[PDB]
Subunit: 194 residues, 2 copies
């Protein structure tokens, strides 16, 4: 049958699927294992079987939202190229709706943790680089199509990526000034300037 | 009376000044009040008279770095207006040197806690709003001086602020792609496109 390692991974993924919104909504500090156990439909003992503590569940929550974002991008892209593809990707990454604001809350919480840890950092650098790579393809396409000028693709990718990572913070913390509509306008005006 | 209150506030400021680098360097999770006490030259008993816990010291650490940044801006501005003034502010906010990378780590730790704490949220909003206000003045000045096109000041402020907040995360987490040089290049190319 399935190796125990794979089985335990599956269970962690299932528990995370059920718990990540609670962590996003309450924050990792207010979140506690007993409430997560309740919400995932597990006993306390069973939950401890799969997770060392809430820190590990924060890590897997970040894996969850990273994978979910990636899947939305892959499903939305179709045959898009250039700026059409870039807008599609950006709309999945930016916190432009309530589900994506919950994702932003998980990311914002994981980041300072990743600053002091390798395992916690690993899934992050890969996620960021995967997006950089796609963004660079799309921006080079735009450059060759003439939908943007003779841009410095590496620097433009970094500008946009940094802007969208800032949105995870400010879209949550200053939602008047960094509303969904404002985020979309910031993207449009940015690409217009290229 | 008043002298006692002033003494109390001065001591909190001194402890904060003595603690913030420790908090940036090890992170708020690994930091504890015993270690903060030792770096400030206090006993734990004595420290409990000024601070209730490490989260309050994180908040005052953020205020400390915000005040420090504002001082750097004020001093460096001189007679600068418009795009020149904007560049000066941005160089103090972005994590383009080692000390500013420490400041970035304070911000990154406070943000997710502010997402679940009214006082920390308020502290962050004050800093973000101060910078939005300054940046808007400079960009209006640029428009009035005829050094930019017909820019949407509100949106451009938001673009640049979000970009700079993302840098606080990526400057630490992806220091190759978000190096000091690349941050400066991001700023220059952004301003050039206005």
């Amino acid at each position: 049958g399935v190796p125990k390692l794979v089985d335990h991974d599956e269970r962690r993924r299932s528990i995370t699927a059920a718990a990540w919104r609670l962590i996003a909504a309450r924050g990792i500090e207010a979140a506690n294992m007993r409430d997560i156990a309740t919400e995932a439909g597990y006993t306390n003992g069973a939950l401890s079987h799969y997770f060392a503590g809430k820190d590990e569940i924060l890590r897997t929550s970040y894996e969850h939202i990273s994978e979910a974002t990636d899947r939305r991008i892959a499903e939305a892209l179709g045959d898009a190229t250039g700026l059409d593809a870039l807008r599609i990707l950006c709309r999945e990454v930016m916190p432009i709706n309530e589900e994506q604001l919950l994702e932003a809350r998980i990311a914002a919480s994981l980041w300072p943790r990743a600053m002091y840890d390798e395992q916690m950092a690993a899934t992050n650098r890969r996620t960021m680089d995967n997006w950089r790579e796609q963004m660079a393809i799309f921006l080079e396409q735009a450059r060759e199509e003439g939908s943007v000028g003779d841009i410095d693709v590496t620097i433009v990718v970094e500008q946009l990526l940094n802007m969208m990572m800032g949105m995870q913070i400010l879209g949550v913390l200053t939602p008047g000034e960094t509303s969904s509509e404002r985020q979309l306008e910031m993207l449009e005006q940015f690409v217009a300037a290229l």
